[PDB]
Amino acid sequence: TRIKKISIEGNIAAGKSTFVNILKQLSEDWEVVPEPVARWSNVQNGGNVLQMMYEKPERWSFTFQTYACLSRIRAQLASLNGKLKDAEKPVLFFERSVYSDRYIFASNLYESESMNETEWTIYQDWHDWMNNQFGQSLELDGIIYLQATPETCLHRIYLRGRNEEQGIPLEYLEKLHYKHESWLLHRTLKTNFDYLQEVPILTLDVNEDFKDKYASLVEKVKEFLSTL
Amino acid sequence: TRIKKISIEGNIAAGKSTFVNILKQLSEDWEVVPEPVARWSNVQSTQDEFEELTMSQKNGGNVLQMMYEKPERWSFTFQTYACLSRIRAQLASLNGKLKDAEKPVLFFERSVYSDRYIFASNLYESESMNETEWTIYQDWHDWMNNQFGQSLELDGIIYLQATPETCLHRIYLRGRNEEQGIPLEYLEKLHYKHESWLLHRTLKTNFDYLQEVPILTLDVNEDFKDKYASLVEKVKEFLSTL
Ligand SMILES: Nc1ncnc2c1ncn2[C@@H]1O[C@H](COP(=O)(O)OP(=O)(O)O)[C@@H](O)[C@H]1O
Ligand SMILES: Nc1ncnc2c1ncn2[C@@H]1O[C@H](COP(=O)(O)OP(=O)(O)O)[C@@H](O)[C@H]1O
Ligand SMILES: Nc1nc(Cl)nc2c1ncn2[C@H]1C[C@H](O)[C@@H](CO)O1
Ligand SMILES: Nc1nc(Cl)nc2c1ncn2[C@H]1C[C@H](O)[C@@H](CO)O1
16 A cells, blocks of 8 residues: 555547656656456457447446446556565556446436446446445556547547447547546536545646657656656 | 455345344445335336436336246346346445444345346246347346456355245235245255355355355344344354454
């Protein structure tokens, strides 16, 4: 629990995995808990619940959200309990968080009328329980939001070519975009987690290419980190 | 861990609650963990510290009803929750009750093992859950009783045996509306699962300590008054073997 805890956020395809695997190299002392989206595509040759979800989300959304939240808690958990353990000044970068799940993705699918009155309620009961328990270990010490405007992400979704994604509309990506602003930019979304509100947030732009601004961002961290 | 843990298994209406709620009054060292069925016919997560001052906790979905009237669609959504609320309940009673007790005993209306190996797996078996839903579910279930290891390890099982016909009847007595549609073939499918787990012991779970767990089998077919004494006597006996 000496391991500092930072979760990289921002929208679908902003540049998360990219930025963080990049920042990982800055220290023999820093590690990365990526989204286990790997699993989700071939659940164990198992089925693709992420694919499933996108196609008919009125049917599969709840089933995805709980399973998504599950796998995260579970890797985040697995990574606190080894590797780094016993190291100069350990640091752990989370591709997203249980908090992104509920209050960004989940919440949004509820508005979308894809998760109903009951599912939305079961999920939050489910999510709370799980994080009055295990998530009393994954308490965020900082958030590093990476902003990127709807239309960049829409196009980065083609740069990646994840078959289960070229169907995702702009409309979708803007909703997702609103929830990040609210929570993270303005802070105009006080959750039901008392501890969140004072926790530090460092925003970085990622709309321009890794051309002539990127390496610089790294520094916005190296210092930003040990400022506590 | 000084507290012993005893689950009460058996088909809908066999009469677990009724029985065991009577059986808890015998001793002060005995307490019972109800099965949250209430909170399944009325789904409701927790309210905001301030919201709850000016706003009630209103009536919300009855997922039990949903899981029964269109299974194909609602079972994973019922399993996930029926299992959650159960573990939460049993877990709190482990850590909140029976401190000032000599030889304490906690009874469960059903185990988390019966959720997964009877209802869920039966529902999987009559394709109301798809491979995908069934995989997910056992992933989540495996992980959870991994994350607690021994905390909820049962110390013994009381199987209450009734016939499907009896049960169907006892279903009509009790009168929960969402059960008046249940046909006989259902409780049968469910009865055989209980006989496999708890009689013939032929069923392969994922927690080995289960095979070796003592199992008391009680016939609850006959109307209550007759066999009570014998059942009460078979229980206290069984209990002083653990
Ligand atoms: N800064 C950037 N500029 C141009 N392309 C990027 C940038 N960061 C990531 N990409 C590309 O966009 C896609 C998404 O990147 P990724 O890090 O996987 O996003 P996320 O992890 O946030 O979903 C990939 O195809 C990658 O090549
Ligand atoms: N031995 C018995 N003889 C007649 N009725 C019983 C007996 N045991 C339970 N019942 C009744 O049958 C119905 C189902 O019992 P209950 O304890 O609610 O079953 P369970 O909780 O096992 O589903 C209730 O009306 C209950 O009072
Ligand atoms: N809680 C989540 N809810 C949804 Cl609907 N999707 C998620 C979630 N967490 C990660 N992803 C997925 C969506 C993108 O396709 C991919 C980008 O990282 O991750
Ligand atoms: N794990 C469970 N899966 C299903 Cl499909 N149903 C259950 C479960 N546990 C209790 N019930 C229901 C059956 C009765 O209708 C009622 C009384 O237990 O609760």
